[PDB]
Amino acid sequence: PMYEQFLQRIQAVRTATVAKDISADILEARHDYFGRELCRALDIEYRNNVLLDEIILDVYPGVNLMEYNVPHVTPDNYIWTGDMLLILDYKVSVGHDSTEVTYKKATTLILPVMQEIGINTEICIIRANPVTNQISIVGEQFKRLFPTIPVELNFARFFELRKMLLDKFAD
Numbered sequence: 001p002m003y004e005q006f007l008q009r010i011q012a013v014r015t016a017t018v019a020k021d022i023s024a025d026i027l028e029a030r031h032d033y034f035g036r037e038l039c040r041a042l043d044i045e046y047r048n049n050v051l052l053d054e055i056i057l058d059v060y061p062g063v064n065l066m067e068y069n070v071p072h073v074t075p076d077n078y079i080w081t082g083d084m085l086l087i088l089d090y091k092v093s094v095g096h097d098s099t100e101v102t103y104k105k106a107t108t109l110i111l112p113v114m115q116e117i118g119i120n121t122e123i124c125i126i127r128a129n130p131v132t133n134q135i136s137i138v139g140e141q142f143k144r145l146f147p148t149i150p151v152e153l154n155f156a157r158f159f160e161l162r163k164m165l166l167d168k169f170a171d
């Protein structure tokens, strides 16, 4: 259905301006596909994106939430071991640039308020290279809890949809 919905939009599109919205949605679905598969292999609960406020309340329900300035920020997921909060962001990319951008933003926006509240937090980004299927991890505590990441990844359907868009608008 995913693939067919995209195929129908790709068939229908006429302008590059509208096509870019299809390209962006295909990129997000590829991201979501990695997330679901990564959480399956890691045997953690899949969440699409959770607000920081909701993470704080799930870990520390007694927080005096209104005493703090919680930025509106939606990391893809999180792991609460019992002692450490692992903020988890997924990336699918052949470069690391977007990983670095998200890392910095998650660092300036999340870690300050977690420090005041007293929650030990780490930013973690897991990146799949869609061409090579190699997994890159950033986050030291995450690497010690999962040195084995048994993902079974196939991005070809996403590559096909985007190739179709590249072919239609190769002007």
Ligand SMILES: [Cl-]
Pocket (backbone or CB within 6 Å): 027, 030, 031, 090, 091, 092, 093
């Ligand atoms: Cl992504």
